[PDB]
Design a protein around this ligand. Sequence first.
Ligand code: NA
Length: 248
Amino acid sequence: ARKFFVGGNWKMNGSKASIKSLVETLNASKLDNKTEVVVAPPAIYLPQVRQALRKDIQVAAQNCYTKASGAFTGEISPEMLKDLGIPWVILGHSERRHIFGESDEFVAEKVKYALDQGLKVIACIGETLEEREAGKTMEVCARQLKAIAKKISESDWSNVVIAYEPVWAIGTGKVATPEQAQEVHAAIRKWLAENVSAEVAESTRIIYGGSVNGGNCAELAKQPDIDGFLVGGASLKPEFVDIINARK
Ligand code: NA
């Protein structure tokens, strides 16, 4: 069975003091040992967190670039992340696609380069409010996934978790209903089966993000094609523990 997966995306939030307190809370918490947990601090706090955090929670960067090294002021390579012992990276997050203009292909290039350099990837996809209203959610998700599949192999998928995050659900306090999320997850899984392989479809975690909190996580977690969550706002708070424990 697919191991339940909960990721915390801290985004551009944190200080030494606030992170120390967040990590202390996590370090004292009783977590379901069947949940794979990853947290993603801002890049400059990766060392602090990797040092201080319980080793059964893994650390992620929030972005990386497509080359080993070179003249890319302000960018970090996957090699650097491995060097510092950071096993995961979030790629293609809605904010990077929509605010920072990362194309489907650029995201796909990052995913391939990160995997080839030994990182595990949370690959983010999802539709805008307008695309949802048009009934084109899966067409968008399919386009974003196809770009990734063009650049990575069948075997490469073993270290990918797909995060489905409707743009209209991110930070808006409007969560997808269990029906809405389940339908997309089942459709993504079918896409994987038809375009990549049945084995990749059966094995790949598809996690939901967009306004997940302590109050709505349990019902979402009961859906047969939802394998966990990518948590933004709630990941900064003690209720993150309740989400890790959503199946408990
Ligand atoms: Na095969």
